[PDB]
């Protein structure tokens, strides 16, 4: 009943420009079968949203990558939050929700905004910069490791580890296997920083360990929960900030609207998350035979969701391929949906907002002035290089 397609959503051709193939996947039907990897695929908003919001049928404890943890061993010990289902997911999720809570954002907002303003001031002195290395990468590295409580030495492992984590959700292709081959020093660094004595007082890591007193998590659970904040959040936020700068460079009318009302900075970043979804794909595993979109999927089957495709589905969005900083973005799935919806979303929005605010107030024009290079990852979408000239306001 369901169409079989040979599209490889983990190929370099797909990474380079996924949007035509995503229309083909959406228009083939609500549920497709991807013969290249023997998985089901859903690329329309409706089915992506339905899958994310039924965690009992479409579980996460068998992995959110291609690998089925019932059949293969995970490349690293499973995440206590991402790779767990309710009820095991519930208490670790609550701890991270309180560590990264609305109240916590007040304690870090002033410092995050100051670092964003300072970075833009510094970049304006150079004029011609790389908006990835010098901005989208440099800014999160200047605020988040400190907010975690990490020491200075060894931070060069953070970007490789994040890219490794998201490559490892993919199939065993060259991108994944080469990342795992070089992973040992990054794993060793990350696992060591998760121990309580290595996390500075007042930071996110120390706060996680402090929750072991409440009954929500035990002391032996805290290192892995800290590991979550050294796995997720870096590359996605980098890619989101880079995408926002890319969009403001490509859509100068939107930069002009943002300059005229810098309070649109938060929604300008949210629209960038919808428009160039930093996380493009990941999986669920069926725990039973299930009818989805008129299709019957058997038990123990991997289901690949196309988050970026759902965020550009014309069945759900008006003018989905336009970047609109006043768009009503509520409902996009760039942060997921349901019980696993990004627990770090307040940190990401804070970083994105204060950076776009600094650009809105200090920059008059953003002009691409060099070759734009794409960064390739099995599940992340982002730029490798974005040469731009910043004109001061
Ligand atoms: C633009 C930036 C970000 C994007 C696009 C993003 C995307 C996502 C998505 C789609 C999920 C759902 C995964 C699933 O349903 O299986 C998720 C979960 C998660 N995110 Fe993010 N994220 C971002 C920033 C962050 C930050 C800054 C942090 C940490 C400070 C973080 C930590 C996490 C964690 C721990 C989870 C697992 C939540 C759970 O399983 O309950 N993320 N993220
Ligand atoms: O708990 C962790 O280590 C972890 C949590 C979440 C992610 C993630 C996965 C897919 C999309 C967005 N985020 C990765 C790792
Ligand atoms: Cl690890």
Binding site membership of 307 for ligand 2 (Cβ less than 6 Å)? no
Data resolution in angstroms:
1.7
For ligand 1, atom 7: residue with the closest CA: 335
Binding site membership of 79 for ligand 2 (Cβ less than 6 Å)? yes
Binding site membership of 268 for ligand 2 (Cβ less than 6 Å)? no
Q: Which atom from ligand 2 is nearest to the alpha carbon of 81?
A: 1
The count of structural domains within the chain is: 1
Spatial CA neighbour of 338 closest among 25, 167, 32, 90: 90
Query: Which residue numbers belong to the known binding site?
Result: 89, 93, 284, 340, 342
Distance CA 377, CA 375 (A): 7
**29 CA from centroid of ligand 3 (Å):** 38
For ligand 1, atom 23: residue with the closest CA: 233
Phi and psi of 83, rounded to 5°?
-105, 35
**CA dihedral defined by 31, 34, 39, 45, rounded to 10 degrees?**
-40
Range of the domain at 272: 1-393
For this PDB entry, the determination method is: X-ray
Q: Is 280 exposed, middle or buried (0-12, 13-18, 19+ CB in 10 A)?
A: buried
Which helix (H) or strand (E) segment holds residue 129: the answer is strand 128-130
Q: For the chain, how big is the Rg over CA atoms in Å?
A: 20
Distance CA 89, CA 298 (A): 24
For ligand 1, atom 24: residue with the closest CA: 233
Phi and psi of 382, rounded to 5°?
-175, 170
Instruction: Provide the token pair at 14.
Output: 């797909």
Contact 362, 151 (CB under 8 A): no
Spatial CA neighbour of 267 closest among 195, 203, 346, 353: 353
Q: Which atom from ligand 1 is nearest to the alpha carbon of 228?
A: 35
Binding site membership of 380 for ligand 2 (Cβ less than 6 Å)? no
């Amino acid at each position: 009943t369901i169409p079989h397609l040979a599209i490889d959503p983990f190929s370099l051709d797909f990474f380079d420009d996924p949007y035509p193939d995503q229309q083909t996947l959406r228009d083939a039907g609500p549920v497709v079968y991807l013969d290249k990897w023997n998985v089901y695929g859903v690329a329309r908003y409706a089915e992506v949203h339905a899958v994310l919001n039924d965690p009992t049928t479409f579980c996460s404890s068998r992995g959110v990558g291609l690998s089925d943890f019932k059949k293969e061993k995970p490349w690293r010990p499973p995440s206590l939050i991402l790779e767990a289902d309710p009820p095991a997911h519930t208490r670790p999720r609550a701890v991270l929700s309180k560590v990264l809570s609305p109240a916590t954002m007040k304690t870090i907002r002033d410092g995050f905004a100051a670092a964003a303003d300072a970075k833009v001031d510094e970049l304006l002195q150079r004029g011609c910069i790389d908006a990835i290395a010098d901005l989208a990468e440099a800014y999160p590295l200047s605020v988040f490791p400190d907010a975690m409580g990490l020491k200075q030495e060894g931070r060069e492992h953070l970007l490789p580890y994040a890219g490794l984590v998201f490559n490892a959700f993919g199939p065993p292709n060259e991108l994944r296997q080469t990342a795992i081959e070089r992973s040992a020093p990054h794993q060793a660094y990350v696992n060591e920083q998760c121990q309580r004595p290595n996390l500075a007082p007042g930071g996110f890591g120390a706060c996680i360990h402090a929750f072991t007193d409440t009954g929500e998590i035990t002391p032996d659970e805290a290192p892995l929960l800290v590991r979550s904040l050294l796995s997720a959040g870096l590359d996605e936020t980098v890619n989101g900030i880079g995408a926002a700068v890319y969009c403001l460079a490509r859509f100068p009318g939107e930069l002009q609207r943002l300059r005229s009302d810098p309070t649109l900075a938060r929604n300008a970043f949210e629209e960038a998350v919808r428009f160039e979804s930093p996380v493009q794909t990941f999986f669920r595993t069926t725990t039973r035979e299930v009818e989805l979109g008129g299709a019957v999927i058997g038990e123990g089957e991997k289901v690949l969701m196309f988050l970026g495709s759902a965020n550009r589905d014309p069945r759900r969005w008006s003018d989905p391929d336009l970047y609109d900083i006043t768009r009503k973005t509520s409902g996009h799935v760039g942060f997921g949906s349901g019980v696993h919806m990004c627990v770090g979303q307040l940190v990401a929005r804070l970083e994105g907002e204060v950076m776009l605010s600094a650009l809105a107030r200090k920059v008059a024009a953003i002009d691409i002035d060099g070759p734009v290079k794409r960064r390739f990852n099995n599940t992340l979408r982002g730029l490798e290089s974005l040469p731009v000239k910043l004109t001061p306001a």
